DNA sequence: CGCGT
DNA sequence: CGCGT
């Protein structure tokens, strides 16, 4: 049995000793030649079906030799093409011969999923009748055959006869439905046992047919067998068992077995009994019949194991990120852009942190990177824990080098030398290489060299020149597969990719929404929580500038809260004012007005809606743009908002797709949205809450939502400090964290508590929501943080004076967290 | 040479006499066996590449025989599968043997266009190096190879040597880049000439390589040739010409020829000259190199002709209706629905006309249709003229029978027997069978039996049972291909299909537009001419009924003209009133108001727009639906329309895609729309005319637009009568014709003129636009016909009091004609 | 009631 | 001016 040898960052199969060179292979016996060829092809098929690898054979000579014609031909038949160079390449050193096998079909959703089969096989064991011959279906033919099976005669006149005359010539020839077999008494029991698996499956798979045993092929005459040797009762039993032993696979109900009719008749010579003849009428089968189990191999664990009949068929016919696959090119250019001329280090924030803690790490890496002047070096504190492997204490970092004219290399830096250091890097490099194929769907020839560096002051296999990254096109296609691989796990770069997917989803939803600028002047946009409402408002206000050619100070943005006002002002899109400022100052020079979070406005200061109409309707271009963005699910107050009644809020646009939160967060919003629908607040108009999200919609971005309850303030605030430290250690920056409390008067109570326990984590800095550019944790109230959002949000004791609003607070809070959310409610 | 014999409604190739049966083929000489096999395969390839047919061979025996193993194997290699039954079927009668060949790839846009090749070939003549052997690319391999080509070493150390020692053993073996050939002096000039076409193309197509001539394969030793026989100067010339004569096909610029380096060296034995050796370094080629012309055949005219190198490659890599292809299933169920239980006759209107003119035609057809009780019988006065063939005088009709458990049959009925009658039906049946494959893209096995019937009181080839229509699934797929075939020609059924495509395009544009009912209450829909504006209004008014659950009398439709009012009233969608009626009567009970052709309204009677707002804004559901459909391109008057100014006409929807007129009509509307944009009328607001149609849009529906000028009234009115008679003879009904004059006062002048000239055409009946259900030609004014449309429209002397409106009249007139338009302007 | 005052 | 009157 072939066993994969584990000292390598790849699948290496040692097939032992194999004779090579056609001259040397010819001199061998047929059995030995066939055994060596079959072992090599078992290895090659196993590597083709398992992501690729290396086949290791030890040759019996020193001088260079060719592989041999039979080995080449079997490989060609295996990949069903003469393009042998694409999948196989050979190198030899001394007494060792290497065959480097590429993967046959790579990825969970290949671009050729419905065209080419996923498995290579030595033989599919599916035969069919092809006029007067029985032929086996190759992998492509068997693939199409199973695909069609999956979708939802003068010869009988002889069959009805109860006896046959010796030497009777049958009129019909051999054809698609008739086969004549000659029956010899010396091996008659053995002959009929071997005949059945070749012809009965061949007939059943294509239209049925008749099998005449005891009829001469050449002259079509009835001969039969010796009567003294054949037992008519025993002969039927052997035939019946040989048919019922054939493996068959059903795609339908019912699952009746193979149907046939067996008739045994006397052969008459001069009116006297001479012997017996066999006729088999095989009705067509509803599904596929195999003569035996398919001969296909796969590498599972460290062994090479064969695929069973059911697993072969199922795999032949039939975390993975759907969004990462379609946006793989857009994501790669955002993060893993390859710079022409210099070697880029990413992530830069984590690289700076590493060289600060460890002395001489900057010189160690820089000296090692001297050979290569183009590519990207991707850092991580532990690439093993990023790929869901176990973390090794004593490792400083891991760096994955993807450079031009170089194979991918995984660098592991150790503080002190260790014997386990090389095993750890080999296991991680092997895991990364398999993910790039089985998960990221890389169709090229990929290898990952495992290298270990020690900060304190088995041979590497030499791959062909085709495994090196030739240029920009190879590095880009490799990195786009790394994008898909990263998105399947929880890590820092996975979370950076996840955020950029959410910005890609919103930019798609904006192009649909942005078409309403030509069609409307006054509009009431009724967005759902996490629908990207505020992001569209900023994008629209840029569009209004571009379409109507008005200057920035001509567009007015009005919001209820101050932190959101400052955030908009810093973008320099337009003039941004609060509602109170809007009702006080004079705005004669304004042409267009955009209002956001209008459901949180109040009438206590003045009639803002009438004022908004007056400024816009007296503009130069007739009725100017007066768009009101609002979300009744996020109603934080019980007073009158000042909006016109629901029947007057026309025309309308509705943002229903949640494109701004990760999957666990988005699923949480919908759950809380249903609660308010059952018990809406009295102030909200009746028809507001019947707006529903998209029928089926998922962002394909994974996140975290955890709720911790009955903890006291010290226990809550410790978990906040501990969790931030773990995030900060992995490389996250403080500007991705926010701690939201219920009320602004409660900020000062908790700000002292946070600094008390979070000072132990070597940072004593906090910021308010009015400052969003500072690289500090933002602590403020939930209501004051509306319009803004952070990757990581901590919600501490959500509370309100009226439980009718309490569902609205959690939705307002939960929607603020793009990916990670931690809530600590009252207990 | 094989010639297609033309007495058949199919491609029949007579390959002469062929020996059949493996026992009989073995006894033959190799040359004779190869010649017979190659002739049969030329025929089979020609039929596979040319839509299918029958291969006719005369066998040398009477009793049934099999085809033979070599013939079967060559057919399998031809179709690259053991599924031999799908494409080939065999029947034999007496001394004649039939092979029925299905088409390889059928259709101009097959469902497998980028997957499977379009050509079957005996050999592609494309070789490549596969490790230590040269292999030919089959059709699939060559297809993929050309697809990739289309997209935008220790061996050198011996090559640099200027001389070689006799018996020197080369270290490297034969491999992907090195080939060792032994050179014999007896045929050295002949050997090198034959060697080049096999190996030089093999190297050039895959990565280049080295060709050593004069080196022993087995022992790798340098031997060379005899020095007295080889001429070094002559030897280079023969090698160079043998390389430059290789055909090559380029997909790129530039087109530099094949690049190679030839070195001839002295072979030294014991320090003395022994002979010469040849080394060739072949650089990889930018494109494909053929060893010789590809061996693929096609049937052109009546001959079987071979494909050249350029035509083979071009066809290998690379009127047809796009709309008919995508809507082929929807169109088929509309017209050619297969009825279960009875044999349907279509078109029913033409069938009734035929049995009236000709006595006993009903009994002739009914007696003939007794055998078959399911299917459809498709009539036409001449199927030949429908397929752009020549019409035969003396034929009464043609009927195409598509029935269950029957091959398609084309019936031709003759008034009197004729010798040309069978030739005419055979030519038409052959033409129809080829169109269903080359144009309609039928992938099944299809035959069309040509039958002739005589009203006044060569053998049919027997096809296999697989050519009969098994059931509903086969008949539907055959008819859907007939739908695509019909749409490529001008005929009655082609025009019925064309109209139903226009109704399919409008129903697509409506689903996009119908989403604006939830988003708007008041809306101003600015439609383009031929955009389907009135059709959406009727569809919306049904939607308003369904969505708001209001009754029909609660919805009010207001239009300027009377005939459109009656047409809407007869639909029972709602209450429909004219503008004058709207301003007079009281409409207190109305909830929603829909206004169409608002640009043609006038203020002389009263302020309709203010009245429309008052009724809708005081409705029960707040501001009820008040949608105004309008089209400023169709402004027929110079007064004030009463609409609010262009800046107040918000929100807006715009119907820009022309989905209501055929291609020649639609192209005419855009040409006239551009004229008004250059010189708009003074009454139209400035920003109205800058609305543009879809950037690129074509209906895929063909029609007719003809302009006849300087004709006198009698000359004009004769062409109207003559053209109607020709249309009516083909089976068109009078309710598809309209004659539109400039002014309603001018109707009475022309109505007498038409009845004077059209009475010769056996119809003396006309109708006004107020009656649209009567089966009579509608004659009325252009303005009075607004909102309605007819398949065939005659426009006689378009005139107006102001030339600023004159472009608007032609657009208003032209948009009335769905498919056929005839205009007779002033001269 | 909460936040901008 | 044209059509519904
Ligand atoms: Mg046999
Ligand atoms: Mg050789
Ligand atoms: Zn079954
Ligand atoms: Zn080229």
Author numbering:
A (entry chain A), B (entry chain B): 7 to 158, 188 to 353, 381 to 519, 530 to 899
Give passages from the manuscript:
We found that SLFN11 binds single-strand DNA (ssDNA) with high affinity but does not bind to double-strand DNA (dsDNA). To structurally analyse the interaction between SLFN11 and ssDNA, we solved the cryo-EM structure of SLFN11 bound to 60 nt ssDNA at 3.16 Å resolution. The overall fold is similar to the structure of the apoenzyme dimer. Both protomers bind a stretch of five nucleotides via a positively charged patch between the helicase N- and C-lobes. Since the helicase domains of the two protomers are rotated by 180° relative to each other, the ssDNA strands are pointing in opposing 5’ to 3’ directions. The majority of the interactions are located along the phosphate backbone (helicase N-lobe: N633, Q634, T650, K652, T653, R656, R674; helicase C-lobe: S853, R855, R856). A single charge reversal mutation (K652D) abolishes the ssDNA binding completely. The shape of the ssDNA binding groove in SLFN11 seems to sterically prevent dsDNA binding. The sigmoid shape of the fluorescence anisotropy data suggests cooperative binding of ssDNA, consistent with the observation that both DNA binding sites are occupied in the cryo-EM structure. The opposite 5’ to 3’ direction of the two bound ssDNAs suggests that the SLFN11 dimer could simultaneously bind to both single strands at a stalled replication fork and may thereby block fork progression.
Schlafen 11 (SLFN11) is an interferon-inducible antiviral restriction factor with tRNA endoribonuclease and DNA binding functions. It is recruited to stalled replication forks in response to replication stress and inhibits replication of certain viruses such as the human immunodeficiency virus 1 (HIV-1) by modulating the tRNA pool. SLFN11 consists of an N-terminal endonuclease domain (residues 1–353), termed Slfn core domain, followed by a linker domain (residues 354–576) and a C-terminal domain with homology to superfamily I (SF I) DNA/RNA helicases (residues 577–901). SLFN11 forms a homodimer with the helicase domains adopting an autoinhibited conformation.
